Amino acid sequence: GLFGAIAGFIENGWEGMVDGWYGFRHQNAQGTGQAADYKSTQAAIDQITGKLNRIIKKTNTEFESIESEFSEIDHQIGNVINWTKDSITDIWTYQAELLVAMENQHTIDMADSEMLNLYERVRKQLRQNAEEDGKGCFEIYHACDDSCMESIRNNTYDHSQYREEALLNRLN
Amino acid sequence: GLFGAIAGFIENGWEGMVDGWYGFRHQNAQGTGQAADYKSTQAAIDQITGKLNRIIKKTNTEFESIESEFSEIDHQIGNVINWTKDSITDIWTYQAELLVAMENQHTIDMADSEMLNLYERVRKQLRQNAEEDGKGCFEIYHACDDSCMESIRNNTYDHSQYREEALLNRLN
Amino acid sequence: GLFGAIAGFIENGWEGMVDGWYGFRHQNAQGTGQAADYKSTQAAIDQITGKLNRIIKKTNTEFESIESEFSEIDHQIGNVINWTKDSITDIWTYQAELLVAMENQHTIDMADSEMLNLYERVRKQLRQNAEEDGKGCFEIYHACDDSCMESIRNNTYDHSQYREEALLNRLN
Amino acid sequence: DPDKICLGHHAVANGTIVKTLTNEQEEVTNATETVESTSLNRLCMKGRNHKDLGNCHPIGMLIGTPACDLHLTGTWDTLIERKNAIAYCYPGATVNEEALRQKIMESGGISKINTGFTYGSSINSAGTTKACMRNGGNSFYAELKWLVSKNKGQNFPQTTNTYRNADTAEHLIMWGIHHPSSTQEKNDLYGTQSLSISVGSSTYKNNFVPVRPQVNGQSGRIDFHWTLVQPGDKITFSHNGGLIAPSRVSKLIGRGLGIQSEAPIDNSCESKCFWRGGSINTRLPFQNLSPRTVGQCPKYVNKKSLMLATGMRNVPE
Amino acid sequence: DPDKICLGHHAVANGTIVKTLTNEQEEVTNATETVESTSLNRLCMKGRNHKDLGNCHPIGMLIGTPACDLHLTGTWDTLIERKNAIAYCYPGATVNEEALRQKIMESGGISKINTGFTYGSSINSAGTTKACMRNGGNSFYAELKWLVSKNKGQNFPQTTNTYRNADTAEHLIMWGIHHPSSTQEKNDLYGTQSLSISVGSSTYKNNFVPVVGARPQVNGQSGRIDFHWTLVQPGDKITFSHNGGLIAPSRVSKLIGRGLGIQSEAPIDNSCESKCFWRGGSINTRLPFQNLSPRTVGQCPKYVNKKSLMLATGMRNVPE
Amino acid sequence: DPDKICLGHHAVANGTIVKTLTNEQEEVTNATETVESTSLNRLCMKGRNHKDLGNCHPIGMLIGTPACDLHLTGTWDTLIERKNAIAYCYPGATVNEEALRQKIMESGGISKINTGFTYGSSINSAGTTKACMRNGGNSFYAELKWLVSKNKGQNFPQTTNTYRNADTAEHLIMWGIHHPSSTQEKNDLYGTQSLSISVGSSTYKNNFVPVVGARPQVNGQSGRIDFHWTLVQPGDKITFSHNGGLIAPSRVSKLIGRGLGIQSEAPIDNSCESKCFWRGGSINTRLPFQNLSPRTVGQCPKYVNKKSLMLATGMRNVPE
């Protein structure tokens, strides 16, 4: 994937996570938690909604019959219509195939990017109090309880609180 | 957005900046300043110029009249013409809407990507002498006078000049 | 480019590397070497193979002759055919140009992304045992022999094995 | 030893395959169809002032064939022809038949204006036949009149009727010529005199001479012709007997949607797109039911399915 | 409080809304239009050897109507036709009117060639009428001759004319047939006997009998002269056997080269250059699309059902 | 110096220039073409039962012109028409010629069914002509008969002939109408009476009158035999009522199946296969587009107004 997270440095998805598209899983002394990230989940859904609104739509152009169903037409003009209709059908078939293939590509990468933008947001929050696992996780180098974990998820984590403790744990 | 900088970790744009698209704002002992970045500003504008050269364009095909303004046309062929012209117009309306939408999407993300590239280039220069703010800034851990700041902006800042000093300020 | 590696922080490509698209050069006490990364190369190649499978194709639509080569067509209907064919040709010329231009843009940026994903995979793998040079290289702060360099390429490098030594050299 | 926080994304057990620019078999968390495959076999006429012609052919509406009696006038925003629809109770064809049919289906209603044509005392304008049966008895085309002599042998008087167009719009007028196969049949009907018919007007003008397999057990034929009478113009028919005459003329008002189908009606469902097989009431942009459609429609494509991704790559555990 | 350097990007107060793949109200810094709505009300004819017909109608200049005296011959790359143009001074209609008109508008010039049709002493080749007024007096079409008998009342002689196409290219030949609307007028000009007019080439064949009936009076004339035409190929003849009633050609036309056929009411302007035209005027624009009209001619932007389509020329606008 | 590991990508000395959305001169490591420029000047007929008509025009198969004696019946999936091919030996033309030609060029074979028409003593039905030569002697259309009075000057009898389609598919019936060069010739052949020819079926009604008059000699013949045609459905009857002037069919045609019609000057080559053809030959490209011709037949790539469109199959080339 373009941004390297989904089907990339993150091994796989989580069938357990039903309350959102992106989110967190932590482990600390006191146990284990899971929570969706609303902002990144909604940013992805909103962007896909806009595609559906643009794509799931037809023109408001009135088309009358040029081919009689129950009677013969002149063979020359019938062939001119058959050539034109097949030419227009080839265009729309191609346009549809391209549209869908291009949007599917864009959707997959857009979703990949939102995962990465959430990850990079957490990396900068934690600053020097954590290190990258490689597998989409952050090994935090201090005691981080559920209120600390909630602060990282809700973006109220202040690295300086835990800096003095964390740098010592990182160094020895 | 895709690359996470513009309308992302950089919380807003700078209306004050009028000599560039991307740029710097510093604060040191000598006070606050601001400067544009030429290389990244041109990369963005050049890419946008190319689009305008490619899209602001009509075909050289000489189309002649097949419908008369000042007189009636045969009824069966005029319906074939009307059907055809309407179909061609639905194609072009669709192709125009898709083009512009796709290019706008790409334009926005390309610009977002130049902001990130400039950020990543500065980050890598400063190396272990600075730390990421999370809002698109770098807190530098030594005395960085206006010449040091100019050396960061001009891609000539040498990290090993201030490394020993800055590593002590960070560890503390 | 979009992902900032190819024609970005990687100064240039290697004309010597001829058994792969992406790969490693290293220097140590034992000498210099080069090797290609198979997995990242095939990722870029397979995506391009996919493009060719979709694009290198014609519609399986039988078209008949509506214009006679060896005789005078009726003047009014021949103008309609001439107008129609020219409209279809403008659509297909425009579509072909837009198809290739867009795909060319995506291919370039796709290949850029795979260079960056490999770089980021190595960065996270080395962890605190290395520092980014800024030109796509990593200055490793310990004795890394050919087998150590082989484990960086083959994704079996254990950072904790060299961490004690490496942190001491980095801080000095 | 150290605590951990892990970023991740959702997945599902049953993913969906879509095609991207690079990958033909790309599994995503969710997808939705863009090409409509399902077709309702019912003409959806909700909110439509419509006229199902059924057994009536649009030509026959203008001349008043026995099957068309219920459709000689009306107003509509939709008109529905059917297969094997009766146009002629007495055998024949229109002069420019398929050009007329499409003009009627392009219009949104018919109103008939009386020509007010009187004939003499010798002539008899009520020429009934056993072919065009109406009301359980011998009858004729409602908008035309069969002109035969009251004296069964006597020669037909050289009569001329005229019609001026009163209304501000164009009026459509239809007539024809009766020919039996033999000469002996023709002579008793309208006299031995070698007569002919000629209609004259502002733009249109032509002469017609009464000149195969049998249809509906009748020996003779009735060949129909037509032209648009201009507003403030006089159509005068000059004949010497043996030509059926228009009692009324037609006026086409506005425009409407000419549907052609075999499928039955349903006023519960609504639609803007129609085809021979039925209706297409889909929100999707594309469609693979028929290239022949009418109205505001999704575009025909040579594709069974095209799945648009509505979620991320599916990466199971 | 350590020393700080901040990366950032510009913004504006008057940001423009554009459409993207995902967002219908996306605000960017700058943008530009792709669908043209403005149109000049003037036929831009710089660098164009044009021909404004004005009163004249394209068919008219083959037969030679009074209005088309200035346009009987000449070469051009563009040919402009106006509304209500006079094709026929003496009333009547051309069979395949529209096919003939298109082929003239498509051409880039006209050359005339003489038929060399001489007529006997008993024929009056210079017949004229009050409908077609030339130099303020009675006249006829320039490229045809109204053939009536010299003595009033007598029969018209069985004469036969034949034009040879000596040229290496095809010529267009035209001819009228007088439908007199009076048995008095039919007899005293042509004759009592039934008239028959026969035409025949290698590729064309037809017979014409003048019908007579009181048609409505227009231009002060109840009769009609209906025209017919064909193309005589290189090295081929065309015969005109007629026992009265025919309006034979004195000259035949040769449509030469190619040219743009413009139908519009708007006036000329020889200072401005353009390549796209329509009824309302010219479309001189760099933009790819337009919403003025679906019916245009020349090198045009494509017609789209859109008032506006804004193409972003800058990043997302994110104000403070 | 510390131990180093450097990430990098490949490059090539001589790269390739492609166009992106933003750049018209973008150097990449490899590219490939999408528009076919080359054509084989040959008709690739491998795995195709084909018929090269040569000198025979497809209409000539139906009326049986001498040129089409080896093409009166047959079956094929491909039918090849050539320039200056002969439909008419005796001069004339078919009404809706291009409709009929296209219908034949769309078929996959012809069958012939005898019509079985018979005529009285007074009719001479073997009247040959010098315009249509066969086996070094005067002849006529193999599938038609010229019906003329056996006694010169005598009126042609009011004859009636009828063909019922006994088959379960539609049959294509053709007939000619002779148009004599003078009132002498018309009276010599069909007598002094007024001629009328009526053709009637359930689905077809038409009347024909021989137009008579002077016109040029084509193949040394002033007279014209114009042709007409219709479809007679299974079970339906078609009756010809005529009193001289009819060129009556002796055989009718059935068009069988489906085939691809090609108009080309290029020679056959049974070694190569193809599904696309144009005037100049075959197009065997796997590419999506093509700039050879807008006029093509079969399963073709789409015509585009471009010399070359290079599709990048590699990254940016940034050489050392």
Ligand SMILES: *[C@@H]1O[C@H](CO)[C@@H](O[C@@H]2O[C@H](CO)[C@@H](O)[C@H](O)[C@H]2NC(C)=O)[C@H](O)[C@H]1NC(C)=O
């Ligand atoms: C135009 O195309 C239509 C559709 O391919 C042709 O109609 C088919 O014709 C034959 C019967 O005559 C059969 O293959 C099918 O029953 C018809 N298909 C449909 C959908 O009705 C038609 O013949 C073509 N017209 C011309 C002039 O060639």
Ligand SMILES: *[C@@H]1O[C@H](CO)[C@@H](O)[C@H](O)[C@H]1NC(C)=O
């Ligand atoms: C074609 O479209 C024009 C403009 O909408 C309309 O006025 C005209 O009636 C149409 N032509 C026919 C033959 O229906």
Ligand SMILES: *[C@@H]1O[C@H](CO)[C@@H](O)[C@H](O)[C@H]1NC(C)=O
């Ligand atoms: C149509 O185009 C062809 C090829 O460009 C040209 O030769 C021909 O003259 C045109 N036909 C008509 C009827 O305008």
Ligand SMILES: *[C@@H]1O[C@H](CO)[C@@H](O)[C@H](O)[C@H]1NC(C)=O
């Ligand atoms: C990958 O490379 C390492 C380092 O040389 C080697 O020890 C290991 O065996 C390799 N992996 C596999 C699966 O062979």
Ligand SMILES: *[C@@H]1O[C@H](CO)[C@@H](O)[C@H](O)[C@H]1NC(C)=O
């Ligand atoms: C997929 O997305 C659509 C909206 O486009 C939603 O209504 C549907 O329920 C989703 N499908 C599944 C299986 O969850």
Ligand SMILES: [Ca+2]
């Ligand atoms: Ca066909």
